[PDB]
Amino acid sequence: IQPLVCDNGTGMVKAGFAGDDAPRAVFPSIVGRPRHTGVMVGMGQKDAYVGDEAQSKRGILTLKYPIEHGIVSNWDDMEKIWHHTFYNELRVAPEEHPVLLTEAPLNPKANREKMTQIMFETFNTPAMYVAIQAVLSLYASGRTTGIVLDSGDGVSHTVPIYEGYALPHAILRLDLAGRDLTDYLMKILTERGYSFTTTAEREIVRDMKEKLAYIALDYDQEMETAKTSSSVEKSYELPDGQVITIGAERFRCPEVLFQPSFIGMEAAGIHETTYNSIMKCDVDIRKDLYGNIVLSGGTTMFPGIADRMSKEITALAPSSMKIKVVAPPERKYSVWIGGSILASLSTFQQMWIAKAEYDESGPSIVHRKCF
Amino acid sequence: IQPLVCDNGTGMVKAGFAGDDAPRAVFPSIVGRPRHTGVMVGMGQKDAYVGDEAQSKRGILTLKYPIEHGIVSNWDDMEKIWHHTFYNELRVAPEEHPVLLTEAPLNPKANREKMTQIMFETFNTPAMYVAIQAVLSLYASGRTTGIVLDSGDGVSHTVPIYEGYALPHAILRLDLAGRDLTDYLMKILTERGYSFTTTAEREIVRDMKEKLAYIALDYDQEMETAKTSSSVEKSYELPDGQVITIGAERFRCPEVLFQPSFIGMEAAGIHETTYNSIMKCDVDIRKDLYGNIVLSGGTTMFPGIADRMSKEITALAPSSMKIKVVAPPERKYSVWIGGSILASLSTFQQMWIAKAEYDESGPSIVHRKCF
Amino acid sequence: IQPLVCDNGTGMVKAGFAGDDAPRAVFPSIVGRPRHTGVMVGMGQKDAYVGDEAQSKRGILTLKYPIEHGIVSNWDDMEKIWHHTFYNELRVAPEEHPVLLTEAPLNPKANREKMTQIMFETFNTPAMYVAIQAVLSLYASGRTTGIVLDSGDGVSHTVPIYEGYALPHAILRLDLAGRDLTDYLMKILTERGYSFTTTAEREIVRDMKEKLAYIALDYDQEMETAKTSSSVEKSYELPDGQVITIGAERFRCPEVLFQPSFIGMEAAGIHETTYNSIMKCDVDIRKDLYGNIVLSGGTTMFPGIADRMSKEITALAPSSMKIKVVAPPERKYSVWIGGSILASLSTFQQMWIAKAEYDESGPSIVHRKCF
Amino acid sequence: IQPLVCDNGTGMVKAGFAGDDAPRAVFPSIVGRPRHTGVMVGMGQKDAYVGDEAQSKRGILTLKYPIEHGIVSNWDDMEKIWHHTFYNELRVAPEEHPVLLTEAPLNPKANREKMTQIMFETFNTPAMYVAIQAVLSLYASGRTTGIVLDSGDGVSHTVPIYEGYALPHAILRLDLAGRDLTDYLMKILTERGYSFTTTAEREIVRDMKEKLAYIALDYDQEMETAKTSSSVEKSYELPDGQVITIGAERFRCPEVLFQPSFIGMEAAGIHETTYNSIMKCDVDIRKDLYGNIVLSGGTTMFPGIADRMSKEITALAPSSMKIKVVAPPERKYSVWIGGSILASLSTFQQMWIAKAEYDESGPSIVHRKCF
Amino acid sequence: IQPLVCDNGTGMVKAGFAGDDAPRAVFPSIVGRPRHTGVMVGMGQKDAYVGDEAQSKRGILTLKYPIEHGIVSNWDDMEKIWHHTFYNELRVAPEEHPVLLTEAPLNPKANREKMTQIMFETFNTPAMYVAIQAVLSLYASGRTTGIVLDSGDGVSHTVPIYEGYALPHAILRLDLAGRDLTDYLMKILTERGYSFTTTAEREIVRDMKEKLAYIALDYDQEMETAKTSSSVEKSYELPDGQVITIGAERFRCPEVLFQPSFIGMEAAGIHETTYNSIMKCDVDIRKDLYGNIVLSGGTTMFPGIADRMSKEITALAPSSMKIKVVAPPERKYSVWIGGSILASLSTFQQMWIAKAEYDESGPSIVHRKCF
Ligand SMILES: Nc1ncnc2c1ncn2[C@@H]1O[C@H](COP(=O)(O)OP(=O)(O)O)[C@@H](O)[C@H]1O
Ligand SMILES: Nc1ncnc2c1ncn2[C@@H]1O[C@H](COP(=O)(O)OP(=O)(O)O)[C@@H](O)[C@H]1O
Ligand SMILES: Nc1ncnc2c1ncn2[C@@H]1O[C@H](COP(=O)(O)OP(=O)(O)O)[C@@H](O)[C@H]1O
Ligand SMILES: Nc1ncnc2c1ncn2[C@@H]1O[C@H](COP(=O)(O)OP(=O)(O)O)[C@@H](O)[C@H]1O
Ligand SMILES: Nc1ncnc2c1ncn2[C@@H]1O[C@H](COP(=O)(O)OP(=O)(O)O)[C@@H](O)[C@H]1O
Ligand SMILES: [Mg+2]
Ligand SMILES: [Mg+2]
């Protein structure tokens, strides 16, 4: 009876039972299709590889995320990911457990409504609820007032909350996330002389982004130090044994997250995003929001992102307020942990919109906006 | 058996037992309502914040004084303040102690009568009495003849008294008080370039009025000195660390209390108010009223208001009479102290109109006009 | 010798000679800066695009209004707009004609004073005057008593006037204007699934606001009708040929102007703004102000705003007084027409503060407060 | 003093003086080495044949392009091509004229920097500049806004430009070009039964690609017509008198340029390449880029490539925008003509980085990114 | 009902029933014609000797392989080999069993189509299929991912396969095979002084190639050791008792297979062939192809060809990947064994194109490209 907490994130799908501490199913939301063979059912190799099988057969597939910046945009491959999780990764009938789902804020209502329609009509979910990822990360942080800055690979949204009482009029969202960081690493590794153009090469560049790239404090001084051949240069073994010496491109990929004009995404920086979310909030809230700024999402796992977020809000904020950038471990999993917290909550048990209630009112039930 | 002395003032509610020297419950009469969330009982955050809790959650609330210039005008939030005091601030059953209540003079009789009705029928008060604030401040001043000039944030009323023998035909009341001073500080800080429009910003402006504003002697000479950048300029830290340099707006807010045409309240100045209350009194009373003019209420806590009241009555009075402007400390609390004096008085124990007497005669009992 | 009437409005700058009927220069107050190229003077493309040139190059620029809610806040780009008008749009030496300027009421005095300083010291204006926009719109309405309700894209201020005799103590100002309507249309088109985040997309959303949005009578009944797919849905061609079907978002953008809590601007509605400006005025003035309420500014060009202003003041006013909501054509240009009227007036020729008088008294001359 | 414009293209090297209309030196960038004899200096036949001499001795040589997809990858044979041009083809001392050089965009910086090092240190160039081929082709097209789609035998890069103001964040590059078309013609002539495996046979296949292959409109209908023995079949005389009847292989070689999955180059088609370069650009730029799409490079000389580019962007673009595929004559030479235009420009005379300036700053001068 | 598996190889024709382990008919594909007598039917000696009879009468015949590098090029003698097999070697009616046929990849389609036409119209085959030899050798190797390097006497083709999913865009073929090795042994035995010019002498040279020639590790060091008269010299008895001492010509015949420039076949070496077939494949496939490289065909029966293939791919591959050159026994027969595996497969029973289906669709059926 432990309800399912499926973090339906952009990059990877995290899923597991409520009341746990780590998801069982941790695998990327990738559906792979072959590119140099026939789809004959007769010999019948397969047709589609989902997640870790797609990661194994990464070479002969056309890997494509079905979702697009939170918008699902492709229902068939998404549904393939759904039943693949439910019947191969967690191995439970979907009518046995309720399904608590996650999303990015400010989504088009057709996405939430048709996702509810598929969960209720294809899988016959007993009951469900769709929650914002940032409120879940705040509940997993163990506090009541903070700003949760999630940036999960398609989105980068900020949400301020003050002792509960969620503020819908200062939630704001960007598009600069880890996908653009991967594409910028493609555009910047062309300077070294290494061709990266395919989806397998895309996943290799994404792996180099995860394991190799750090973030500096002063970008200009670090560019000054990246003139002599110093310790900023580093090698990396490719899966065919090839070695790439990555020099100044270590720190100049997370520089996009604080200078979005380097890829031409005309928007504010993430520090300016959070500071303007503070400025949209009124006074007497700011003192409790300058001191509990909380990072979340997997793209806050850069080494030194907290001290880059410090000295930069500090330049924007007045210099008499405590700038307490809080970045815990398991920032990848904070949304799932908060979903497991709310799914275990007895007070939350009023919020499970049942399929019976879906047949009672109709598909317009999913925008009642309660907690 | 010590009866309750509840100063039901406009700005803050002062309450405490009789025979004390300071009220236990000192908190503003503010009921706050949320403005960016739902009022769902299920999660059930709260619904209303009263006084100091509203002062803590000042940012996310719509703060609103229920009372209006002495007229209560909103019975539900006022009743919320009543039981919040009686069960959270003083922590006593209201049938255990009698309740001595305060009011501004010349109120509409429905306010006093329905307040008596709520104290007798909702709370089951054993006995009560409603007294004028100025007579209480005179009894706390320790004299028998004087003019008490109370101005408590919605009202500014003057009462002359001569050795007892309260004069109902020279009591006169205005509306110019600290609320209009706060709104004038909003209108005058727009010249500096600081937006103040919300109720949280209203309370911040009220705090600046309390802690920063003094009152001059000659307003024209002080405007003459407020042309060079001199010591009249002063800074102030806001709760988000913002700094406002307040220059000539220090002294030009209490200038409204002696020039009410600056906000368009077409009435007499407070000095002209008191002088005309003297002129409404007959001769052989004036000599004992020019020498015992007593300030009271929290809006007489401006630095130098006594010497501004001097030289100004002196210009109105003939120059052969002692103009003795008396302004003690605890002018905020003088009404409560006089209420504690009368509530301790054995002679006053005839005046406690009981709920039994309320059932004896009816709701018209509250206008017998005795001492 | 025809003096310049420059409507220095928030959205667009209207300017022309006195004694005319329409401004020659009608172009938005926008200074554009490039975002994907170098500012090398050698090839020297340009550096800044002003107004209609910025509107032409809307795609490759960072369009930014220099002004901010009446406050100019950026003197260099504003000065660029000034000399661009004077030397490209009207083509006259600024010392040849006097310059009558417009502003929103309750501005910080540094804005008016430094604007006068730039007009007198950079351009060498012969003489000038700064007038409130609402008094100009009343003079262009051809009446002597009314309430002018201007809402020009950064401000929304109301001014009551009774047979001349301007009342400074009932003029009141808000911040809810067309800029917030554009940002709310961004926040509400995210529900349809159309990304609008850049300044070019901002101007496209502003164009859709001008050409597509109407205003309802009963918002709740119109939301009731916006459940079936009815004629409230409508398409719009984007400059790349894209088509957006706008349904209930037609009428729910001007709903912000009568429900400012939908964006969290905690203030009164525009109807409550005007009604409270009436209540700040005394009786015997109200009968001549309930019958001559005059709309002005470009954001009163919504279809049906007069009948929305009716039935809503009528619910606030007593039901025995004529509620005559007057909304002429050319409400965009009414401030400029009234400026052309006063600039043609021989009686007004005492009010032209010359640069010689600026050197006579000093920069404190601009607050003498005469008509 | 007419500076050298050397189109350093992949296939052939075009070079000539500035201010002309056609290059003097038009010969392929091929260095040939013997394969059935000794390299004895004693008799001393030769050692290497460059370009047209290699084309004459095509049979007994191992013909090899030194460059590789824009990357030079072989400095000695490239330097042989350089001095062979400068001393046999144009016959001028390289210190007499400045050398304007061309390249494909997104090259590894070592290629540009060491090419500058060789031009400055081996040849002692007086001054130089390296320009993108697409900007040169746009300047030779005589317009200011367009998308130049160059595909010169190793690369196929698209560049959007809007009234100057070069956009570095929508330039994107592929590898599918004429080299892969030649290798696909080898792989597809094996079906006819004609062995092509050597570099002489490679050049013969390249000549058949130039002179024989057209491009269809509907590939499926043209495959339908290529079932009956129709006029799509055609003969060709080889240099030994052999005759090959080429049937459906006429049109199915440029089909690779619009179906890159036929050789397994997992990327977008050239139409999808240009359409995604449009989509990377923002709106208000697209209308001026759907109407001025410009082809360039020698591999746009297929018969009917303009009408194949039409009806295919039209299926991708919305059907309300003018799709004006512009394909001039001399698309081979457009880069050289634009180089002759900029090399004649007096405004461009600031951009000639001298060898003196190379000794001033150092070899890092070649990435200042100015026009 | 066991279907025929006829390895239609270049050198010898292997044929036998499915489900066996060795072919019954193992004889060379040679048709012999007399050269010193008349073809009179009257006495009627014979006219043509096929295979082993031609091998017996090797002296008085003009032995000629009908096939040419996979291309059959002579239909009458090939048809003689077909019915000679079917009626003298296996002794079964061809309509009794289906016939699974083998071929080299990239053949001209007329060869496959007319071979199908002869099998269906002359012999009346019930059903058939034509498979690539390398896929058969991989299925006989018992793995799913590898590179099969077949070199059967006319061809030398490499095919990479990854868990099924056959890659048509990295299959590549040469012409250097055992025929050229035999002709090079003719050209190199002229140095010893032994005339070999006839087809009988050709078969004797081929027998010496099979039984006498090994392959070295370092060719230069083995040439260094082939200066003193050492154990590299060896004798051989000819069928007339003649003895040839073969010295350095032992190892210098398979040196052609790794140095194809010694006969002037301008192509890559077999190690460079396989390495470039790896490079044509993408990454994440290479690790499973560097470790399962599989030799096949009879010309991989040289002593030490595995250790020559090692240290040579190892010099080309990076030195951090396992180079596992796998060379089983029965590399001659691996194609036939894999054909017997697929001909026994029940899943493969969809692939038997019947003569009925040949009359259904037509002769274009043989290019449907399924497994
Ligand atoms: N060590 C790391 N450093 C920087 N980024 C990381 C690291 N590990 C993971 N990431 C980023 O986190 C992403 C996956 O986490 P997350 O954003 O939570 O997925 P989702 O998109 O589902 O929210 C990866 O795409 C990667 O970009
Ligand atoms: N130091 C001060 N200077 C000027 N005014 C003050 C000061 N302290 C308090 N006040 C005024 O006193 C008010 C509260 O006191 P009081 O008038 O007694 O409340 P009530 O309205 O209940 O009578 C505040 O609203 C403030 O305007
Ligand atoms: N047809 C229309 N319907 C609604 N609003 C309009 C219309 N036309 C113009 N507007 C509004 O009027 C504004 C420009 O007029 P105005 O407010 O006079 O400019 P300013 O800010 O200079 O006063 C635009 O920003 C737009 O928001
Ligand atoms: N008539 C033609 N039809 C198709 N392609 C052609 C034709 N003429 C030339 N080409 C192609 O143009 C190439 C040479 O031109 P170009 O691409 O400008 O050289 P570069 O590689 O130097 O840019 C040749 O390799 C050939 O592939
Ligand atoms: N012991 C051996 N050493 C080297 N090569 C051999 C040996 N035995 C056979 N061969 C080669 O194998 C060839 C026959 O095998 P194979 O290539 O399978 O025939 P096919 O051409 O039908 O594929 C002979 O022509 C010979 O060149
Ligand atoms: Mg995630
Ligand atoms: Mg009080």
Ligand SMILES: [Mg+2]
């Ligand atoms: Mg305007």
Ligand SMILES: [Mg+2]
């Ligand atoms: Mg070229």
Ligand SMILES: [Mg+2]
């Ligand atoms: Mg064989």
